[PDB]
Amino acid sequence: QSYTV
Amino acid sequence: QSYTV
Amino acid sequence: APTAREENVYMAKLAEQAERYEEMVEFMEKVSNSLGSEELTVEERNLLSVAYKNVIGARRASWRIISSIEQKEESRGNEEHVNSIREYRSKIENELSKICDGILKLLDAKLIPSAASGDSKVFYLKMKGDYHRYLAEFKTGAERKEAAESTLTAYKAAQDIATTELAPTHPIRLGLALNFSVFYYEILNSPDRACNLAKQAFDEAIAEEESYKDSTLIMQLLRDNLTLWTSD
Amino acid sequence: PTAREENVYMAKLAEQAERYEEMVEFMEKVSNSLGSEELTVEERNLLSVAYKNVIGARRASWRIISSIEQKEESRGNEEHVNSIREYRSKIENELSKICDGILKLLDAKLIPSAASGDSKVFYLKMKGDYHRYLAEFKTGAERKEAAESTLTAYKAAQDIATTELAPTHPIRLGLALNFSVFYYEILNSPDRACNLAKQAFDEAIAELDTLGEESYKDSTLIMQLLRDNLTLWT
Ligand SMILES: COC[C@@H]1O[C@H](O[C@@H]2C3=C(C(C)C)CC[C@]3(C)/C=C3\[C@@H](CC[C@]3(O)COC)[C@@H](C)[C@H]2O)[C@H](O)[C@H]2O[C@H]3O[C@@]12O[C@]3(C)CCOC=O
Numbered sequence: 001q002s003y004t005v
Numbered sequence: 006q007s008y009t010v
Numbered sequence: 011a012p013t014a015r016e017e018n019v020y021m022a023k024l025a026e027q028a029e030r031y032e033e034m035v036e037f038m039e040k041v042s043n044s045l046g047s048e049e050l051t052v053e054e055r056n057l058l059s060v061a062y063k064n065v066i067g068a069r070r071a072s073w074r075i076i077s078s079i080e081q082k083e084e085s086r087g088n089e090e091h092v093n094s095i096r097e098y099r100s101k102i103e104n105e106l107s108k109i110c111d112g113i114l115k116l117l118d119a120k121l122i123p124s125a126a127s128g129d130s131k132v133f134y135l136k137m138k139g140d141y142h143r144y145l146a147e148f149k150t151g152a153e154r155k156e157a158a159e160s161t162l163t164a165y166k167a168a169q170d171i172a173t174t175e176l177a178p179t180h181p182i183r184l185g186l187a188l189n190f191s192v193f194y195y196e197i198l199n200s201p202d203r204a205c206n207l208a209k210q211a212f213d214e215a216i217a218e219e220e221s222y223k224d225s226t227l228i229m230q231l232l233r234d235n236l237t238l239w240t241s242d
Numbered sequence: 243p244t245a246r247e248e249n250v251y252m253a254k255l256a257e258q259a260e261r262y263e264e265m266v267e268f269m270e271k272v273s274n275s276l277g278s279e280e281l282t283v284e285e286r287n288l289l290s291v292a293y294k295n296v297i298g299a300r301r302a303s304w305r306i307i308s309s310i311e312q313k314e315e316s317r318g319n320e321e322h323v324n325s326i327r328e329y330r331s332k333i334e335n336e337l338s339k340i341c342d343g344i345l346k347l348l349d350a351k352l353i354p355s356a357a358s359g360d361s362k363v364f365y366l367k368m369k370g371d372y373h374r375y376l377a378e379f380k381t382g383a384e385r386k387e388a389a390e391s392t393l394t395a396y397k398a399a400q401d402i403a404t405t406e407l408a409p410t411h412p413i414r415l416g417l418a419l420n421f422s423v424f425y426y427e428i429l430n431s432p433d434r435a436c437n438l439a440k441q442a443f444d445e446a447i448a449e450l451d452t453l454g455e456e457s458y459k460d461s462t463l464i465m466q467l468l469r470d471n472l473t474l475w476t
């Protein structure tokens with residue numbers, strides 16, 4: 001669920 | 006474009 | 011334990027959640043092409059309809075974008091780019107053609123012929139109009155004339171049954187009214203006819219529980235269309 | 243036109259059309275069918291995007307299917323569970339294949355030929371990312387190895403980034419973002435995660451006044467993502 005790039 | 010359903 | 015019909019139907023609901031629409035088509039084809047005389051339940055036909063809609067809807071989106079890009083490159087003078095786009099556009103067009111063929115084939119062979127009530131009659135007929143409409147959006151030459159004609163025929167046929175047979179509130183009658191009015195607009199290129207058909211079907215159900223949500227939604231799409239149309 | 247250029251043009255067309263399997267094929271053609279040159283900045287970017295999009299659609303399918311399997315296990319509906327599991331295998335098969343595509347290219351060409359430290363850090367991040375996505379669904383020894391393989395690629399990439407790249411560099415900032423998520427999500431270590439993000443963040447903050455207009459958009463964006471993970475975690 002976490003934000004990554 | 007225009008709404009269809 | 012669930013039958014084969016029950017099971018493929020279930021597999022289809024998973025594919026819908028997972029957003030894997032090709033697979034959802036295949037499972038829904040299985041349910042259909044294992045029958046004989048039986049017509050599909052309301053649930054099943056709604057699923058086939060959703061399955062195909064999303065599969066084609068991704069090609070139509072891809073198509074519009076790629077169209078906008080060659081046209082922008084046609085006027086930038088960019089010649090080699092235009093050709094590559096052209097060849098790519100064709101690859102998107104083969105898929106489009108093959109998809110419409112899937113559902114037209116099954117509609118002409120099975121679904122249309124065994125529709126008993128005025129419910130099912132209007133449905134597969136709407137469906138047939140819908141998928142000839144998508145053909146019309148991209149075909150040229152003779153192929154174009156043919157499909158737009160098949161679009162009118164099917165849409166007009168389903169119209170009679172709708173007016174004589176179904177409440178003007180009913181979701182199906184209203185959907186047809188919407189899509190029909192869009193056909194007159196985008197392909198038949200006549201604003202006024204699109205506006206008359208759309209203006210009237212709104213007005214009629216302005217007169218008349220299970221259907222509330224669906225209807226009010228398609229009623230809202232009508233207004234959303236008339237207002238956009240009127241303003242341009 | 244040239245062979246390498248229109249493949250690139252084709253990959254940009256496929257991006258617009260949202261047809262990411264095709265985008266990958268085009269960038270593949272570009273990638274190994276060079277020789278021993280590096281990929282250009284714009285090619286690198288187009289590659290990582292093409293793979294991220296193909297993999298993410300499957301990540302998203304896997305989560306939703308994996309969540310329905312669990313709810314159907316509580317209801318005691320044992321047959322649904324068998325059907326769902328089998329579907330889940332199909333999606334897992336695709337995931338292993340996708341990861342294998344990129345991880346093959348990275349080990350064979352891309353890591354061995356990066357000359358600037360920018361690029362070494364870029365491809366070592368990529369490698370970290372794809373192992374991380376194997377660790378999301380593999381189990382047992384397969385998991386343990388994906389998790390180990392991940393830690394070392396991020397560790398390597400970290401050891402170079404802190405010493406050669408600006409604290410505000412978008413690629414440095416990206417490593418720290420994913421690296422922190424790896425700890426949070428893979429290793430169940432909220433506090434390592436919080437502290438690794440926070441440090442990367444503060445270190446960027448103290449160097450801000452000297453941040454190029456060239457990297458401004460991407461850096462400020464990865465800085466917000468580090469803040470949002472922090473806020474949700476905290
Ligand atoms: C599961 O298949 C879709 C399903 O369609 C049924 O409704 C038909 C329908 C639509 C309405 C949401 C407007 C759009 C897809 C669908 C299946 C199609 C059509 C409409 C109107 C005509 C038609 O288009 C058929 O074309 C032949 C009818 C059949 C709806 O009852 C259900 O009543 C909807 O209620 C829920 O389930 C339906 O959508 C939802 C889950 C309810 C939430 O609506 C969304 O916000």
Ligand SMILES: COC[C@@H]1O[C@H](O[C@@H]2C3=C(C(C)C)CC[C@]3(C)/C=C3\[C@@H](CC[C@]3(O)COC)[C@@H](C)[C@H]2O)[C@H](O)[C@H]2O[C@H]3O[C@@]12O[C@]3(C)CCOC=O
Binds near residue numbers: 364365413416459460
């Ligand atoms: C996506 O490929 C194109 C390109 O990547 C570069 O951006 C890199 C980048 C992203 C940024 C939006 C943060 C996300 C994908 C990409 C290629 C990946 C990475 C970031 C940093 C971490 C990394 O992830 C490296 O991973 C191996 C860098 C290379 C960005 O500069 C460009 O500077 C952006 O400018 C526009 O074009 C880029 O993205 C955008 C279209 C602009 C973003 O839109 C609004 O800001």
Ligand SMILES: [Cl-]
Binds near residue numbers: 300301302375379
């Ligand atoms: Cl996953």
